[PDB]
């Protein structure tokens, strides 16, 4: 049910990235493809999504007509080519299963490219808790949002984030219940009880119900009391 990406490019400004995503697992066909990238020591940023529809191609308010998306039903391999590549463009780009109206339930290790309206979410910082204890974390939309469409992930530095909440209050694959899902409009939560030594990573929000941008918070870290 996992994916598997090609390999790290070393481009040049100017010219244009190709970066590949075969998969194996359930019927490629009927399920949507996206691309998200990660700026170094930035958020995620969500370019465009994919079906077989291949008219389906869409992509956010910025990156459009920069970014091209791909895809081929018989081999199973969708693709992502970024044109005019610059300094800012530097940043592990990730492929994942689903984007409108479907949370990223798995999720690609991530190719590294190196170069050389809105729905805004908004997180709440920095936050250094010990294990045993209750962790409270907050997420505020610029506009009310359905529910249907709010969902967490957790991400351990060196890897791809991990669906925890889908559906603003539904527990993900794997998922225990000492994580515990959001509700409304605007003030969405994630509450992490009995706290333990490998829930400590940094937590995401998402925004996945309309708005062409298809949105991220910024970020909470969360760490362990103490230096």
């Known amino acids: 049910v996992q994916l598997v990406q090609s390999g790290p490019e070393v481009k040049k400004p100017g010219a244009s990235v190709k970066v590949s995503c075969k998969t194996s697992?359930?019927?490629?066909?009927?399920?949507?493809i996206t691309w998200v990238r990660q700026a170094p020591g930035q958020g995620l940023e969500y370019m465009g999504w994919f079906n077989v529809y291949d008219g389906k191609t869409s992509y956010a308010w910025d990156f459009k007509d920069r970014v091209i998306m791909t895809a081929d039903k018989s081999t199973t391999t969708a693709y992502m080519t970024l044109r005019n590549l610059r300094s800012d463009d530097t940043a592990v780009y990730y492929c994942?299963?689903?984007?409108?109206?479907?949370?990223?339930?798995?999720w690609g290790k991530g190719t590294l490219v190196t170069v050389s309206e809105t729905t805004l979410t908004q997180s709440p910082g920095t936050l250094s808790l010990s294990p045993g204890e209750r962790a409270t974390l907050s997420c505020r939309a610029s506009?009310?949002?359905?529910?249907?469409?709010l969902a967490w992930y957790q991400q351990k530095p060196g890897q791809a984030p991990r669906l925890l909440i889908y559906g603003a209050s539904t527990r993900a694959t794997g998922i225990p219940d000492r994580f515990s899902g959001s509700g409304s409009g605007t003030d969405f939560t994630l509450t992490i009880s009995r706290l333990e030594p490998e829930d400590f990573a940094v937590y995401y929000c998402q925004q996945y119900g309309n708005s062409p941008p298809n949105t991220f918070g910024q970020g909470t870290r969360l760490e362990i009391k103490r230096a």
């Open positions: 506009q009310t949002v359905s529910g249907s469409y």
């Open positions: 697992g359930f019927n490629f066909n009927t399920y949507a």
């Open positions: 994942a299963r689903d984007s409108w109206e479907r949370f990223f339930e798995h």
